[PDB]
Amino acid sequence: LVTPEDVMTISSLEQRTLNPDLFLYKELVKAHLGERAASVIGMLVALGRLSVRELVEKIDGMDVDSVKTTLVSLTQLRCVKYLQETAISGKKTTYYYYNEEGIHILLYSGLIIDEIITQMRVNDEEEHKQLVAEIVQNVISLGSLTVEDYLSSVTSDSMKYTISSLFVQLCEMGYLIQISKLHYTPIEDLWQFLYEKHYKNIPRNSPLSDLKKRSQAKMNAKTDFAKIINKPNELSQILTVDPKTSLRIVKPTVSLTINLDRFMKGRRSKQLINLAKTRVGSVTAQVYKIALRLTEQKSPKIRDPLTQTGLLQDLEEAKSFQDEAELVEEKTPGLTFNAIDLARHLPAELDLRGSLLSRKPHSASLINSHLKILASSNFPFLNETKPGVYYVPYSKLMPVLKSSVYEYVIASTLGPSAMRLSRCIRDNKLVSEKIINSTALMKEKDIRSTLASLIRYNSVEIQEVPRTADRSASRAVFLFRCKETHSYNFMRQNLEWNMANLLFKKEKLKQENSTLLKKANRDDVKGRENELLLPSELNQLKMVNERELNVFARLSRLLSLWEVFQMA
C-alpha cells in the first residue's frame, strides 16, 4: 500500500490542484526570467488588474526600486499590459495587466526559430540560415530589437548591409510588426475608451432616442476600432522611405518587435498540411502543402478580430458577428486565387502528371482539378464563388476541425468502442439508453464501461428526467446530451496543466543538477566536455542531458496540440 508520505512527492498530487493558466505561466516565467518576475506575473494572473502598490502590499517583495526593475523587465519581455487610469478628483496612477500572448514568444521560441529556418525560400546556404537563426533569437530574447543598436553593433559594413536587407522581408512577411500602444492595453478598455467618446459627442435634443443613438454609437465605435486596429496590424510605413542613391531602408529610430499572428498562421497551415499528409496520399498531399502557403501570408484572423473579446457578443440578432466574418471572408479578393496564380509558385520537384485518373508540366488545368477536388471534399477546405477562382472558408471549417481534432484526441485516449460511442453521441444528437443500442449494436457491457471511463472528463453531458414534480434521477431513466463546449474547454485545462508539468519537471531537474549544469555551461568547458571531467560525473551529466533532450522532445510533441484548441 502506498504511503501518504510516498505520494505527493512522487505522485505529484499537490500539483493537481494548480490552475493551469496560473501554473504554466508562472512556471514559464520562473524558468526563463527569475523568481521575482515569476511572482509578479503569478500575482497578476491571480488578480487580473493591479497597480504597483498592489504588488508591494500583496507580495513578499515590498521594495519600490526592486519591483520597478522586475516589472520593467517583464514589460520589456512583452509579458505585461499597462494603462493609466485618471481619477479627475485627484492624482492618477497607472494599472497593470498581463500579456497573455507575449509569453508565447518565450514558449514558442524554438518553434518560432524552427519555422524561420524552414519557411524561407533560400535556406540551403549555411551562413544565411545561421545568421537568420541568430537574428530571430536576438529579437525574441530582447523583445523589441532595433537596427539602431544592431547596425552599430555589427563590425563589417557588408554584413551590416545584409542585416538591413533581411528586415524589409521580415516586415513584409509579418514576422516583424511595429510595436505600439496596441500591444500593452486591454481590448475591453480600448473598447470602452472608444465607446464613451461617441456617447459624449452627441448634442442634446436629437429626434432619435436611446435605442438608436446607442446603435449609431456602437456602429461608429466598431468602425473606428476597426480602423485603429487595421492600421498597424499590416503596414509598411516604417520601410517605405528610401534615401537617395541607396537601397530601401526601414525607420532605424523605431523598435522592431517579432510578431506572433502570422507565425501562428504558418503553424496552422503546417497542421492542416499534416492533416492532409495523414488524410490523403503524398501525390496530392505534396500539392496541398503549398496550396495554403500562397494564402497563409494574408490569411485572416484565426479566432477573433479583437472586436469579440472586448465586448459582449450580442443579445438579440446575435448572428451579426458570424455573418460579417463570413462576409469579409467572401469579399476579400486577394485571398481568392485562380490556377494561373498557383502555377507560378509550384516547385520544380512536383510533377502533377500521374496525379489524376480522368476515368475508372505545371498545367493550369490539373492544379485547378486538385482545387475542385479540394472544394468537393467532405471537409470544406475550399469554396467556389465563381468558376475557377476559389477561396478558403473559416465560417464552417472551424467547428468541424475542432470536432475532428478533439474526437481523435479522445480516440487516442480511450478504446475503439469508446471512440465509436463518442462518434454516435456526436452524430446522433440526444442519444438515450435504447438509442445507443439501436445506433451501435455493440456489446453493451464494454459500451457502458467505456462510457463510464468517459464521463470523468467533460466529454458527454448527463441529464435528469423527473417522472414527478420533484427531481430524482433514480426514480426514472435518464438521457444523454452533447454539450461540446465543455469538451473544448477541457482540452485547455488538461493540456495546459500537462505542459506546466513538463516545465516543472525540467526546472526541478535543473534545481537538483544546478552545480553540474553550471560547470557544464562554461566557455572553455563548452566543446571540451570529454576531457576535464571525472568518469562518474561525466556519465551523470550525459544521462541527465539525454533526459532533458527527452523532456524537450516530449514538450515539442505536445506543443502541436494546444494551439488548435486555442482558436474560437
Binding site: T278, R279, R423, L441
Partner: protein, 136 residues
Amino acid sequence: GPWFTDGELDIEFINSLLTIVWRFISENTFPNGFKNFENGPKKNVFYAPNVKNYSTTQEILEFITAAQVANVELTPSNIRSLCEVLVYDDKLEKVTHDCYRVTLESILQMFSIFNYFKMFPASKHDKEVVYFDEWT
C-alpha cells in the same frame, strides 16, 4: 433481425459484418483499391473530381447478398442500419445520397495526431511520461 440472438449482441458475428461492408468500398473507391497504396505514398493515383467514385446503397446490397457471408437476407433499411453503425469508428465517410469514402484507412491498418500507431509509448521506467488522466 438476426442481430438479436439469445438476448446478446453477438460479439463475433456483428464484428465480421462491420469488417465486410467497408472492405468492398475500400477496393471500389480507389482506382486500384489498396494495392495503389502498396507501391508507396508517392506513387498512388487518385480519381478526377467529375468521376463517380462514390458507391450507392444498391451496389453494397447486391455485393453483400451475392457474397452469402451473413447467411441472412438484408433489408435496405438493415443495410442503412449497418452503415449507421459503421459510419462510426472513422469508417465510411457520410456523403449526400448515402455515399461513402475512406482516406487514411490503409495508414491505420498498416505530430500528425490522426495516425498514432507509428508512435509508441515510452515503454520504460523513466520519468517525464505524460498521462491524459493525470489531471483527474
